[PDB]
Amino acid sequence: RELQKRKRRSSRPTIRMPNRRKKALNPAGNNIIAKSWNKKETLSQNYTRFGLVAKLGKATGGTAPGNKALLSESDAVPQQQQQENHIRQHDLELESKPEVLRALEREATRPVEKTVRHQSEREREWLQRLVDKHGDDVAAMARDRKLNPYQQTASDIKRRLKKAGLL
Amino acid sequence: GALKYLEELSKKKQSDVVRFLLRVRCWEYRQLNVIHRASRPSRPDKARRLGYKAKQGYVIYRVRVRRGGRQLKYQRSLRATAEERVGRRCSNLRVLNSYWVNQDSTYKYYEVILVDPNHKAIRRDPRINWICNPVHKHRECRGLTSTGKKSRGLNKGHRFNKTRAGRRKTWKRHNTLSLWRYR
Amino acid sequence: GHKTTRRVLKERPSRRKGAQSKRTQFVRSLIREVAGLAPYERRVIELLRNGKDKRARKFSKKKLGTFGRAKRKCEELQRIIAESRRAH
Amino acid sequence: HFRKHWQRRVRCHFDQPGKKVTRRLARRAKAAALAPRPVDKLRPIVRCPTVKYNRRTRLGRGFTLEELKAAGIPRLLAPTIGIAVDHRRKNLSEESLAANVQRLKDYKARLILFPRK
Amino acid sequence: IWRKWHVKINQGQKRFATASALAASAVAPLLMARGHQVSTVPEVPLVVDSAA
RNA sequence: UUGACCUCGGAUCAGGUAGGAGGACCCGCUGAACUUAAGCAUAUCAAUAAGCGGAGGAAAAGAAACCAACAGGGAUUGCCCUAGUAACGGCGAGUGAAGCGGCAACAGCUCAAAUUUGAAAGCUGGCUUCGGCCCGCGUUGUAAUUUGGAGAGGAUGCUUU
RNA sequence: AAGCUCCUUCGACGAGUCGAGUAGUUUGGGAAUGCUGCUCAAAAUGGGAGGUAAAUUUCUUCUAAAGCUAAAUACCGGCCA
RNA sequence: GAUCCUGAUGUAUUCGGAUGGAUUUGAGUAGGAGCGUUAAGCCUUGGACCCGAAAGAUGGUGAAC
Known part of the structure; x- marks a missing residue:
């Protein structure tokens, strides 16, 4: 008070x-959602116009009309009707409408490149020297202590040869 | 390797080897200063399980605390008094932890593992540099060490109803008259 | 009450958080011989070597606080007596 | 029950609509950060503990590892694609397993996963 | 500040009052008794076409 | 005679750090009395005021040695009801929670107990032509791997940068 | 460098700490509600807490004594509006 | 609901209450009246219609008997 x-x-x-907020209230960029985001519309109306779900939980209040954003057995097995020990780990294998939804499907479904990992020069030289002495006997290459110092299994060396194209 | 054996030995404190070693050390510590720098932990298994590392920026400090009552009992633990006295001597360090090392008829001896927050070996390590943040200034004075966590009753359950989130915050929450707009 | 089909659960790795491990038993036995005995353990062992088991259990219970801890300590010291006689 | 100094501890709520505006703007900020994503994570259906509320169900904390494995969703991918995981909960019966597995495959049927780059 | 500033009214009574006000708005002597200059207004619930 | 190690010191040596302020809110320590019970001492006031120590933009708490008895729930925090209920009490004054239920917000992790042992693989400083060179710390343990609804090692074949 | 799968191989989990006795302090709370001081002082198919008259402590549910962490929460002070 | 006897078919063989009787009760039934809000009055607690002790406690400032 004395200071004031x-x-x-x-x-x-x-x-x-200045009224600098820590978090921006509107999405930005050159992606699909940014060019179709209405700054004067709420989250629910924007996600309704996109054709997407905004909240995956249980409804907590009433919504406006047209919300569309606030979402034989031989062995008695409850899971056998659910079907369509290792699964793919880094992705899923998933098998009229609003334009934003179709654009999102199109950009998610477009083909991409893979950037196949090559092999080092020394690994190619090792696999080459391994072929020059035994040819195709991958068991003999695994047995070889001199040319295969790391005692790798014949399956691993066969896989490396197949990747090198040296069969 | 050897730390498993030292943990099992530390669990027999009245056996002949440990009793002999505790008495000889107590004699030496009694004749030293109250708060003195320890070159290395006397109990390396205990210091290592509490977060002590043989790295530049880690310091042990042995401290003796007069034992007994304050029939008014001091609600502050003797181990908390030890960390506070060491934290004032080393005001540039952060108290990491502490542990019992010895006890006599009139004193209880404790070793306090401290960490230098300005050393570059500590500031670059993501496992310890949380203590470099200024919210950890004098953890021993705010009941934020292990003794502080025990004495404040910061446990889960019905037995710790009034203290698990702070006793005074719970009391202020229970003694607040909430009047809403539409009553 | 309600009827549901109970499942067989995956074995909990937190089960038996003590020690069924042979190495910790080895370390515990070795440390016991190296360290020696506490004075009260030596009094219990000198009562057990004289056949006064009742006094030993009462002394252990008095100095430990529980009848179960007393029983466990008396069994441990009797085992130590047995291996000491076997080595003798 | 006014024995203590209740004058110094009266909490009024004149900032109720302002806090509602603040909460809605926080949800808008979450929407701006996670632009095509929902602002919420997927949560399982669980039964209410006591006998009084045993008849009804509610939303849980996260899906069990067995439920994720049975639905075909790997454990490490699940928190990165909007599914909540709870390692403490157990299924204990074949009826909560089937319900939350159905929920997970229903979520999988309506998901647009984008490649990393 | 902990005076009662706001009044809780039942939503049914508020909807009753809003419907009564809407019904009163369709009566023209009530419009002039309130103080509105409507002597050139052709019909009291003055409906115009949406295309305008 | 000489050189290590260990321990304890000195230096106006080099690089740093702490103190004070502020303290509405926050974390601790310490701690009354008036008053009510138409007297008063248990009780209440109040685990409050005053006093002392310590932070931040929030703090604290926090990923169960939890709740529960269920067809089960699932870190912490806060709002609503629970509920003036349970419980305790010159059973008087009175004091007085919590689980469940609805909501707001949600996020999980790091170590110690292992032998890298076919190679301390780790780090603070000083000198710099800034690219790589020295001293030191450290084996009484610095990196990597692992943290018990886990994990390791081999084998295995896909999938990831 | 990394995830998963499989198994005639392994799987280490915190002690003057739990706990017993006792004196204060505190709580709605003698399974002392929690904490602290003194004396004694643990375990390993272990330990903690609950359920249950049900025939004996059957069963249930978690892992203490090491540590970090945003958000929702408070706000008579600071920069403003 | 519950209480007082008489004490059925039956009963796992130690459980049960059928018939007839009582000076029975109840904040019991016998065709629901409540919930929310507004206005006024009254009661209890907060400074409590306004002003008005001796005190007591906490923390400080000075002296000098």
């Missing part, structure tokens, strides 16, 4: 803070 009285009688300027 001091600044009122002081000639020192009042330092006005």
Whole structure:
């Protein structure tokens, strides 16, 4: 209070803070959602116009009309009707409408390149020297201690040869 | 390797070897200063399980605390008093932890593992540099060490109803008259 | 109450958080011989070597606080007596 | 029950609509950050513990590892694609397993997963 | 500040009052008794076409 | 005679750090009395005020040695009801929670107990032509791997940068 | 470098700490509600807490004594509006 | 609901209450009246219609008997 009285009688300027928020309230960029986001529409109306689900939980209040965003057995097995020990780990194998939805499907379904990993020069030289002495007997290459110092299994060396194209 | 054996030995403190070693050390510590720098932990298994590393920036400090009552009992633990006294001597360090090393008829001896937050070996390590943040200034004074966590009753359950989130915050929450707009 | 088909659950790795491990038993036995005995354990062992088991159990219970801890300590010291006689 | 100094501990709520505006703007900020994604994570259906509420069900914390494995969703991919995982919960019966597995395959049927790059 | 500033009204009574006000708005002597200059207004519930 | 190690010191040596302020809110320690019970001492006031120590933009708490008895739930925090209920009490004054249920917000992790042992693979400083060179710390343990609804090692074949 | 699968191979989990006795303090809370001081001082198919008259402590549910962490929460002070 | 006898078919063989009787009760039934809000009055607690002790406690400032 004494400080505020001091600044009122002081000639020192009042330092006005700009209204800089920590988090932006609208999506931005050159992606699909940014060019179709209405800044004067709420989250639910925007996701309704996109054709997407905004909240995956249980409804917590009433919604506006047209919300569309706030979502034999031989062995008695409950799971056998659910079917369509290792699964693919880094992705899923998933098998009229609004334009944003179709654009999202199109950009998610477009073909991509793979950037196939090559082999080092020394690995190719090792696999080459391994072929020059035994040819195709991958069991003999695994047995070889001199040319295969890391005692790798014949299956691994066969896989490396197949990747090198040296069969 | 050897730390498993030392943990099992530390679990027999009245056996002949451990009793002999505790008495000889107590004699030496009694004749040293109250708060003195320890070159290495006397109990390496205990210091290692509490987060001590043989790295530049880690310091042990042995401290003796007069034992007994304050029939008004001091609600502060003797181990908490030890960390506070060491934390004032080493005001540039952060108290990491502490552990019992010895006890006498009139004193209880504790070793306090401290960490230097300004050493570059500590500031670059993502496992310890949380202590470099200024919210960890003097953890021993705010009940934020192990003794502080025990004495504040910070446990889960019905037995710790009034203290598990802070006793005074719970009391202020229960003694607040909430008046809404539409009553 | 309600009827549901109970499942067989996966074995919990937190089960038996003590020790069924042989190495910890080895370390515990070795440390016991190296360290020696506590004075109260030596009094219990000198009562057990004289056949006064009742006094030993009462002394252990008095100095430990529980009848179960007393029983466990008396069995441990009797085992130590047995291996000491076997080595003798 | 005014024995203590309740004057110093009266909490009024004149900032109720302002806090509602703040909460809605926080949800808008979450939407801006996660632009095509929902702002919420998927949560399982669980039964209410006591006998009084045994008849009804509610939303849980996260899906069991057995439920994720049975639905065909790997454990490490699940938190990165909007599914919540709870390692404490157990199924204990073949009827909660089937329900949450059905929920997970229903979620999988309506998901647009984008490649990494 | 912990005076009662706001009043809780039942939503049924508020909807009753809103319907009564809507019904009163369709009566023209009530419009002039309130103080509205409607002497050139052709019909009291003044409906215009949406195309305008 | 000489050189290590260990321990304890000195230096106006080099690089740093702490103290004070503020303290509405927050985390601890310490701690009354008036008053009510138409007297008053248990009780209440109040685990409050005053006093002392320590932080931040929030703090604290926090990923169960939890709740529960269920067809089960599932870190912490806060709002609503639970509920003036249970419980305790010159059973008087009175004091007085919590689980469940609805909601807001949600996020999980790091170590110690292992032998890298076919190679301390780790790090602080000083000198720099800035590219790589020295001293030191450290084996009484610095990296990697692992953290018990786990994990390791081999084998195996796909999938990832 | 990494995830998963399989198994005639392994799987280490915190002690003057739990706990017993006792004196204070605190709580709605003698399974002392929690904490602290003194004396004694543990375990390993272990330990903690609950359920149950049900025939004996059957069963249920978690892992203490090491540590980090945003959000929702508070706000008579600071920069403003 | 519950209480007082008489004490059925039956009963796992130690459980049960059928018939007839009682000076029975109840904040019991015998065709629901409540919930929310507004206005006024009254009661209890908060400074409590306004002003008005001696005190007591906490933390400080000075002296000098």
